[PDB]
């Protein structure tokens, strides 16, 4: 359960504002998809549609 995680971590080839923003979005969504607590995971489907909801479960 840490193959996608490693790819989301060690990309680090971004060269633009949008590229780093995409890195952030991918990192955030992935963290929700796989979480020990079931309550957080259930929100994943909504986050993909509404971004402002992300950046609130990030911490």
């Amino acid at each position: 359960s840490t193959i996608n995680l490693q790819k989301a971590w060690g990309a680090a080839r971004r060269v633009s504002k949008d590229d780093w923003l995409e890195w952030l979005r991918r990192l955030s969504l992935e963290l929700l998809k796989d979480s020990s607590s079931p309550s957080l995971r259930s929100c994943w489907a909504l986050a993909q549609a509404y971004n402002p909801m992300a950046r609130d479960l990030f911490n």
């Binding site: 079931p38 309550s39 259930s42 929100c43 489907a45 909504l46 549609a49």
Partner: protein, 88 residues
């Protein structure tokens, strides 16, 4: 609409007999949404409310008046909504 409630239900079932804490926060708004929406989601909201009541059992006392008022208002000879309300 849908996802927002679809998640909430899943939380309650997972928590067990501890979701009661969140009743004052959720219930006042939830009912207010049913009175002001489109004909395309009322049945789904009623079904989800039924599931919520099933999970919460006796701690649903203070909201029964508003629930009953809603059922009174939205009971019509239409065949579809009647089965949902009967199951509720």
């Amino acid at each position: 609409h849908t996802m927002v409630v679809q998640a909430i239900t899943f939380i309650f079932k997972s928590l067990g007999l501890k979701c009661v804490q969140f009743l004052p926060q959720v219930m006042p708004t939830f009912l207010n949404v049913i009175r002001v929406c489109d004909g395309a989601i009322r049945e789904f909201l009623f079904q989800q409310l039924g599931m919520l009541v099933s999970f919460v059992k006796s701690h649903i006392r203070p909201y029964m008046d508003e629930i009953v008022t809603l059922m009174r208002e939205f009971w019509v000879m239409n065949t579809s909504i009647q089965s949902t309300i009967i199951l509720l």
